């Protein structure tokens, strides 16, 4: 397989996942099947224990893997459905090697980082790259590997040592390395400074990799004097120093990479047999004039992404108003064209009662369904089939008249079957008939609650129907859309 | 507690365990209760899976812990009985942190090397230092920590980062660091070279520790010009550059440290409220003239140590003749004053039949008992009580007429109770009466087989009685000793 | 002496010279005599060969030393007059050691970086610290050492190794180290990132120094979560993590350091026997409402500084309009309340003829005098005495009626004595009577040309009289000031 | 040109100069013209100020360059005559860059290590490689560059950064790097340890070079297990891990490199168009049985080398007896078959009077001529012509009847012309006729004194005639040789 490593310098928040997902959809537009793997140097096995404040939201995969949001970036850009072992962590690898040792698999030899941990990294990366992650059983051609962290962090040292070796245990034709680095710009002078990138490239080069591309992220476009310094002190040609500045949307980030000629570079380097939508969506986004104000009652990234897909599909700008549910909160809730009550693991019941009584559009997700059932009366993890109990339901029209949907669940509580006879219609259930998994309130333009998280299914080309329904309702257009 | 870290430079085989055990028995001679901990940066949990070729023999603790031989050095020097958690490994610590993560104990925070692994190291080192490892319930005063590896190995980086912090999270009065480094000597010139030590001290200093002592190990004593270079370039006073050269025995290594004044240094530095035997045993060893040639039919370190304790106790030099049992082997076996058949997990039966028929003294250990029972006819891990079935047995006289002994076992097979009635006397058994655990053959000066490993119980001050019995028999003196 | 090292991390432009000059005037306000030294790791001996585009302007000292502008920051803040050896460069030190070697002074020993270059650094820093740099012959108490560059640059490695040693070859009471580091703030999130500071502190700690203060420079004030990360990962208490954000003026930067409590820290640490103006000037600067627009026809730093001193002294804001003299340039020159033609080594004659014919206030400096003499008709380095040829001159009134002034020259051409009889009055000359060094044109509110650079004499408390005269004339107030 | 860099690891004394000179004479035997350059990271310009105790003897070049002894190794192996700029030092390069700065040659730009010092290294290495250093005006094909020091020393960092760049600013076909590293062997076990080499290769790889060959120097030949560890952890094939053990003579070191196949490696790598004497001389040296005991009254390396060339040419082993001239010294001087009084800058007169009165063979060099003239009565640097005053002189027969010789001088005193008329024959003089430069005493088998140092002219294939004459006289064979 062809491998593209993406390493970070200076600071992690520079958008490496957006770079990695961008070069993935570029190569996908060039007809190549692209896998992705994320390395997270954290010792946590899965993100199921994380707070959404730490590493952003917990993204859920079809197999029930709970991971950080950058796997959702890979899904949303590439239109792939990842498996849990496309997340590599230090915890997963050290536990593997430890469990191999206790089986005797290392044949009485001393286990140590080089070779055994570095070989575990290589074995994992070789094998999960070969796994069909598009719906085609046809084995992938490229695997993009985001090495999370910044090079120089001690946690990341096993992985760069593995990738150093993986150059030599492959071929140059089959392995390239992107370094994404910050070029800070001083407020006093406008002077863009190269010294972080120079020092970070020196560290990466000290660890036996080298930049095949340097990707400057910067506030303003980098001047030629700054690119000359980088190409000199980082020992890479001008064509190999790429600038991504602040732009309107993530839709524009692939387009900058075309304009900086990465496909010529990867064609030459990786010996490859080689957008429209990305320009169209970027150009749309810059030309949005109508506003939809949704009350949301990186902690809710896929939620926001799904709304913005939906918003762009109806040529509205989203004015997303985040509201802490313990609560100007009610002022925001007055100019709410829709209420979105997302998931979590009580004060949300304010907004649900408001939405119900004032007939303001409502989407409840997970907890929002449970609370809506409770309000009206006053782990199941990964992909499951939810069957519709009628065809007279708004979500069934939105999903295209299909008798069931398959969506990603993450919940440990459910509605009691014995109490549903006290009743708001329960419109979707599990195949067992026990759990109700979708509610719709009929005396309302759009008040639906779903047990599942349809966010994780959202992609720009196909907005999440429960989130689309909300934005259609919030602009009156639902009555048109179903007609 | 007071802590003494011992770090290695250049190469691991320089005797750091002998330095650490030496400064331990020095401080014990000064009346201080000394704990020891060994850090092994290997990812192996326990040494139970190791080949005796890799890391030397597998030493067995009373609690059933299977560890590398350097814990046996701590036991043999200090006369302490260690617990399995006095061995720290990367595997034990990473598995701890991983299992804490899966319990939720890190409260939805991202686990990473600093802090979480470094804190696990500190927590472990604080708590196992406080554990009474002498028979006194009186909590220890000093803990010697051998950091295995060489500083600069990637495996060791979590530990030095932990110890960097442990300086600051303690007091200077409570933490010192020994650096043991090679001073290589060129064959062409006799020139002793300081550059390895300078470079290794620079690495240690780059990792936020510093030498409080530099211990040069060297072939010849270091000249003053060499010590001046080290004290300049390593930024430490002349009194803090100690030389241990090649000497006769490990018995002399504490004595060099007295003569290089470490007790004055530790009194001043560690604010401490402060040998004979070590000189006596060293002086004896240099004056040994009689030879005992034992056929042994670092893989057998505690075995060799136990023989040399026994040999010194009868003022003989041991000419230990190692013989691969698949086999000049029979030439060695002809000048064998005793056969020692140690443990392992078939060709040994040559030497046992030889020993039986020619009346040459025999000690069989573990496998050697099983094979001796088999020859005459032609896991249970850690401390167990073995009871004697008579008082007319040579081992019972050797052990001082006691009705039982408590010795360290490591075996998964045993003699069949149903077949013992076919019978060589079975002299010791388990308390259950099922397993026979000691045999003696009566028509022989000394042919005993034991299931246990009495090596691990050997200390210079009290030689292992089965090994002593062998050397007494091999010199005729057994008939005198029992009389 | 007490020493304060100031090291940089991430990027050089963060204002380390302003930090170093700030802590200097703080300690001066506490009654201490403060020396300053700047280390520039460049191999250039002097700045006399530099372009003003590279390292900013060439600042000129009284002794004829041509240095970078940060020595001018030390003069302007502290009111000291530095000597050329208060600039240390790699070139000056390597040439010293080389010339010592060629004299035989190293006694046939091999010269190498440690010790000989590192000792040369220490010898220089010890001795130039002791030099009275205030007008008091009373030896200094503190020496602030700005280590230019960023720690991690190869050029700077001799100096940090010297300062590592200088800790130990002094006392902790006599040596502290400030680390100034960038905390970058992401545009997408507002998230302030600590990873550069953590990595730069790790480098500094790897080189055997440590931060006694960490000074974050940042766009916004740092949040407490960001300071907690820094105090944890950089192993320094919260009180030792100082935040300097973007503020109105350099006048406010000492005031932030008071408010972050550096005097308590230095009192405790350095065992010291311990502003108004800085607050007053900061508060004035923020309250400026009147504008003076001067046409200037970091390349002209002391010029801009001298104007802003003058502007603040008449409570006007300076709208400094820089104009490339080869040239909207004439649009700027129309709204010029004064023309300033600075020095350099032809198109400037446009602005001088304009200024002369339209009676718009003019200051010509060096080249501007020479060009003004030429227009009307159509090295001498460091402090020299210029004598006035009358008392009926505007500059003599401005300088306080004194018959001569002593100002800093830097010119290789001068007016021909034989041609002055063709004449615009020549008002000041050298003591030799040969060179005319000041001109005034009488038929004009203010058209003066001076050979010297009176910028380098400017300090906030005493604005440069030729620059003050310009701003008084540009606001009509000159007629009042002389009256 | 093709370039071969030779870097050191662990310790400098491992024989890198002998490796570099060996691969030079290998490639010379393959018909290639080989230049050599030595980098000495010392700041000393020339070795003229060195003590012979520090860096060994001061070797003198034809151009009057005074250098360390490793340039003499290049001359003695390759039969080249080096120029002073074939020695590169930090002092020579920093002074070059400094002097360029003061000429304005860097065009007002800031001088710093990268690029300017690194470019100076490259410029020097490119240009002195092209200089004909054989007597052929035909430009060289290979330049061997010994990088002195050990990689990891701060002094050497400019040079490895230069060579990192010089890979890329050349081609792989034109640049290879040898790493010479110590494999220490423990006395206790015979275990050969790879960890120094692994750590030193990691440092070299961190500095952006990599071993193309790893040359282990070792006491015993390295076992295959040790070479497997090195080829794994240093990431180089088995064929690229070469072992040079302790051997009889330097003559055998090329032969080991043939037997380890370096010519196949350099043919493949460097794309080259490709001994006897070295085997013959090695085999002779091992078979020497007759002894010649010379009293010498690395400080005298070329002297010892010249004696051993001479000794091998008459199939005697040299028993060189070094005697401190202030002085068992006279016991050595009794069994002296010849006295050698070398140069230096008084007690030597004991041995000269002894040699004269007892008719024991004498060679006086420089000071030894001056002292011999003084005893009988009781800078001029580099190549000069010395003319013979007769053909009835022993040195003229030894040098092959030639009327003059050209030999390397290094003296500041000479014999007074006015006093020679008081006279021992003065046999050779300068062309000016002023200085007497050779004496011979007639009433003696061999008592000659020379002003020059004929050591520096010695090569195995052509022994230095004054040193040959001594050893012939000391074995009676002079009377045969002249006949
Ligand atoms: C190297 C990165 O450099 C830069 C430079 N400048 C700006 C940004 C930037 C970063 C994040 C965002 C963002 O999150 N925007 C939103 C959105 C809608 S759709 C989607 N992404 S998506 O569904 O995964 C699929 C389409 C790809 N994002 C509205 C929420 N917008 C801009 N990134
Ligand atoms: C750690 C630095 O952090 C920050 C944070 N925020 C802002 C700044 C900042 C940097 C430079 C400037 C500046 O140059 N301002 C001017 C001026 C007038 S007088 C003088 N300096 S001076 O004469 O040497 C003597 C008084 C000290 N400067 C107008 C030209 N103003 C603000 N620096
Ligand atoms: N995913 C969620 O929103 C969780 C909802 C609720 N706490 C449950 O466990 O069902
Ligand atoms: N410790 C040993 O010598 C092992 C003996 C034998 N293999 C057993 O398991 O009993
Ligand atoms: N300092 C300057 O402005 C230089 C002016 C002019 N070039 C001279 O040398 O006199
Ligand atoms: N080269 C030497 O032996 C020096 C001899 C003597 N000191 C001189 O200067 O002539
Ligand atoms: Mg973070
Ligand atoms: Mg080993
Ligand atoms: Mg710069
Ligand atoms: Mg040396």
């Amino acid at each position: 397989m062809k491998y593209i490593l993406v390493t970070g310098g200076v600071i992690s928040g520079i958008g490496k996942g957006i770079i990695a997902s961008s070069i993935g959809t570029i190569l996908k537009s060039c007809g190549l099947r692209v896998t992705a793997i994320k390395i997270d140097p954290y010792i946590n096995i899965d993100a199921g224990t994380f707070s959404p404040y730490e590493h952003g939201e917990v993204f859920v995969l079809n197999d029930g893997g709970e991971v950080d949001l950058d796997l959702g970036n890979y899904e949303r850009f590439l239109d792939i459905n990842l498996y849990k072992d496309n997340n590599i962590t230090t915890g997963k690898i050290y536990q593997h090697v430890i469990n191999k040792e206790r089986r005797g698999d290392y044949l009485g030899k001393t286990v140590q980082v080089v070779p055994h941990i570095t070989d575990a990294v290589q074995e994992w990366v070789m094998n999960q790259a070969k796994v069909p992650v598009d719906g085609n059983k046809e084995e992938p051609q490229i695997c993009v590997i985001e090495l999370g962290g910044t090079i120089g962090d001690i946690e990341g040292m096993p992985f760069v040592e593995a990738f150093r070796q993986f150059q030599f245990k492959a071929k140059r034709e089959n392995f390239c390395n992107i370094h994404v680095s910050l070029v800070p710009q001083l407020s006093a002078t406008g002077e863009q400074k190269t010294k972080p990138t120079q020092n970070s490239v020196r560290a990466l080069r000290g660890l036996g990799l080298s930049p095949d591309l340097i990707v400057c992220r910067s506030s303003t476009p980098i001047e030629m004097a700054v690119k000359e310094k980088i190409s000199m002190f980082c020992h890479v040609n001008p064509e190999q120093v790429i600038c991504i500045h602040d732009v309107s949307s993530t839709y524009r980030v692939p387009v900058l990479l075309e304009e900086q000629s990465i496909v010529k570079y990867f064609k030459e380097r990786l010996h490859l047999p080689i957008l429209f939508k990305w320009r169209n969506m970027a150009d749309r986004y810059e030309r949005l004039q109508k506003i939809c104000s949704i009350a949301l009652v990186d902690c809710y990234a896929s939620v926001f992404k799904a709304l913005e897909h939906s918003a762009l599909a109806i040529n509205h700008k989203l004015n997303l108003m985040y509201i802490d549910s313990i609560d100007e909160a009610w002022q925001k809730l007055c100019k709410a064209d829709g209420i979105l009550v997302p998931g979590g693991f009580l004060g949300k019941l304010q907004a649900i009662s408001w939405a119900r009584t004032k007939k303001i559009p409502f989407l409840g997700v997970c907890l929002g369904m449970q609370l809506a059932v409770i309000e009206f009366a006053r782990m199941r993890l990964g992909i499951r089939r939810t069957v519709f109990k009628t065809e007279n339901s708004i979500l069934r029209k939105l999903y295209g008249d299909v008798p069931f949907i398959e969506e990603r669940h993450r919940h440990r509580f459910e509605v009691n079957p014995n109490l549903i006879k006290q009743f708001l219609s329960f419109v979707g259930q599990d195949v067992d008939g026990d759990r109700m998994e979708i509610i719709e309130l009929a005396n309302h333009p759009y008040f639906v609650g779903v047990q599942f998280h349809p966010e994780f299914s959202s992609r720009p080309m196909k907005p999440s129907p429960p989130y689309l329904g909300l934005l259609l309702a919030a602009t009156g257009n639902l009555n048109a859309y179903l007609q």
Side-chain angles (χ1 to χ4, degrees), chain A:
Chain A
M1 191 154 311
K2 304 292 181 284
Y3 299 96
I4 308 183
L5 181 67
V6 186
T7 53
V10 191
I11 46 145
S12 285
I14 56 188
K16 317 200 306 288
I18 308 164
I19 309 310
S21 302
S22 291
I23 74 195
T25 188
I26 294 272
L27 298 166
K28 199 210 181 188
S29 298
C30 301
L32 298 164
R33 300 178 296 287
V34 178
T35 351
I37 283 166
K38 184 160 173 45
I39 318 301
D40 287 272
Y42 64 63
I43 296 161
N44 307 71
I45 300 180
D46 312 327
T49 47
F50 272 138
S51 71
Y53 292 78
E54 178 57 43
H55 224 29
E57 61 164 24
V58 176
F59 189 79
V60 177
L61 301 172
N62 288 340
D63 58 8
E66 297 176 285
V67 188
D68 62 87
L69 72 76
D70 287 306
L71 285 207
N73 292 327
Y74 299 127
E75 297 202 354
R76 288 183 241 107
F77 274 87
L78 288 65
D79 195 10
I80 62 182
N81 277 357
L82 295 177
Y83 309 93
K84 63 193 178 182
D85 299 333
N86 293 84
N87 187 230
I88 303 186
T89 89
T90 301
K92 293 178 89 184
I93 277 175
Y94 278 69
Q95 194 62 70
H96 184 251
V97 170
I98 289 165
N99 287 355
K100 283 187 75 178
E101 185 283 328
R102 299 189 308 100
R103 293 171 206 314
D105 309 344
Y106 292 119
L107 304 176
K109 198 74 64 174
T110 294
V111 302
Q112 49 172 76
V113 173
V114 190
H116 310 88
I117 298 287
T118 75
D119 296 343
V121 174
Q122 291 170 82
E123 289 163 18
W124 199 307
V125 165
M126 283 171 68
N127 291 320
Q128 276 299 137
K130 290 186 297 179
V131 171
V133 82
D134 182 23
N136 281 30
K137 61 180 177 179
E138 193 179 27
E139 178 174 297
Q141 290 163 283
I142 286 163
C143 180
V144 181
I145 299 139
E146 200 216 326
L147 176 51
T150 52
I151 196 153
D153 60 27
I154 174 164
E155 300 76 13
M157 290 201 290
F159 296 95
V160 295
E161 186 65 357
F163 291 113
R164 178 188 72 72
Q165 297 167 184
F166 206 59
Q167 290 170 137
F168 310 154
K169 295 169 64 176
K171 295 181 179 295
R172 188 177 172 278
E173 304 170 288
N174 289 269
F175 190 90
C176 69
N177 169 67
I178 320 300
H179 194 63
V180 192
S181 181
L182 188 76
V183 177
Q185 191 164 332
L186 286 167
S187 49
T189 56
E191 192 188 12
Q192 293 167 322
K193 297 300 242 174
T194 58
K195 203 75 163 185
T197 301
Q198 295 169 193
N199 292 349
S200 203
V201 168
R202 194 173 59 253
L204 171 76
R205 187 166 284 150
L207 291 167
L209 291 158
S210 276
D212 298 306
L213 290 178
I214 294 175
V215 182
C216 303
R217 163 85 177 287
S218 68
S219 301
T220 306
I222 76 182
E223 289 341 307
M224 294 181 68
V226 189
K227 186 176 295 202
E228 285 284 344
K229 277 195 192 172
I230 292 165
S231 50
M232 191 177 81
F233 282 95
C234 305
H235 312 96
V236 100
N237 302 99
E239 54 155 61
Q240 295 143 30
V241 185
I242 290 189
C243 171
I244 286 165
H245 55 88
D246 293 336
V247 287
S248 53
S249 180
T250 44
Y251 306 125
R252 185 71 70 201
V253 178
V255 181
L256 296 183
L257 289 162
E258 284 290 352
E259 293 171 348
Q260 294 275 268
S261 75
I262 64 159
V263 199
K264 185 194 296 180
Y265 194 74
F266 292 144
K267 173 176 167 60
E268 182 62 28
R269 170 45 174 274
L270 301 166
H271 291 58
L272 301 172
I274 71 179
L275 295 179
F276 171 70
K277 300 184 183 181
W278 298 100
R279 302 196 74 106
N280 194 313
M281 292 191 300
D283 305 340
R284 284 195 188 204
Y285 197 87
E286 293 172 9
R287 293 184 304 98
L288 296 176
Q289 287 155 77
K290 294 190 181 181
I291 294 171
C292 179
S293 42
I294 297 292
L296 207 168
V297 176
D298 293 351
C299 309
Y300 288 120
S302 288
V303 175
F304 170 37
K305 301 268 184 177
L307 293 162
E308 285 276 54
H309 299 157
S310 299
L312 198 70
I314 64 167
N315 280 31
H316 286 66
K317 186 73 171 184
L318 187 70
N319 189 85
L320 192 60
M321 297 182 303
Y322 180 58
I323 291 164
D324 302 316
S325 57
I326 54 172
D327 301 345
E328 295 183 356
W330 287 90
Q331 187 184 337
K332 289 173 175 177
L333 212 65
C334 291
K335 60 177 289 182
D337 314 334
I339 284 75
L340 179 57
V341 165
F345 290 100
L346 166 57
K348 296 170 178 291
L349 291 154
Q350 289 178 180
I352 305 169
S353 58
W354 181 258
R356 177 180 65 70
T357 196
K358 301 191 63 55
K359 308 302 176 68
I360 299 169
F362 181 75
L363 177 57
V365 175
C366 182
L367 192 60
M369 193 197 87
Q370 296 171 357
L371 271 47
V373 162
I374 276 295
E375 194 283 311
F376 196 81
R378 291 174 190 184
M379 193 188 286
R380 187 164 170 80
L381 231 178
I383 203 162
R384 300 289 183 284
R385 184 172 290 188
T386 303
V387 303
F388 285 112
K389 299 172 67 183
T390 183
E391 189 166 65
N392 198 97
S393 57
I394 312 303
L395 287 183
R396 181 150 170 188
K397 305 309 180 69
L398 287 164
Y399 276 105
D401 308 334
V402 292
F404 64 77
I405 54 185
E406 291 182 352
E407 283 291 357
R408 304 182 197 180
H409 293 69
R410 184 201 189 206
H411 65 103
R412 198 184 304 97
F413 290 106
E414 53 268 305
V415 167
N416 188 332
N418 301 309
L419 274 62
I420 79 189
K421 192 167 66 63
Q422 190 177 184
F423 302 75
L424 199 85
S425 63
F426 296 93
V427 154
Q429 61 188 172
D430 52 22
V431 184
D432 308 338
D434 304 330
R435 303 184 185 79
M436 308 304 116
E437 301 197 304
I438 305 171
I439 68 185
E440 304 188 352
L441 170 55
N443 297 91
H444 202 296
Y446 193 76
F447 178 109
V448 312
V450 294
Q451 267 299 178
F452 49 87
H453 285 261
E455 312 102 63
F456 305 148
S457 185
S458 75
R459 307 204 191 319
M461 323 307 177
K462 46 180 164 66
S464 180
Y467 281 76
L468 186 64
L470 175 66
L471 265 73
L472 295 165
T475 60
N477 296 310
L478 184 59
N479 302 298
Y481 184 103
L482 306 183
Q483 180 174 188

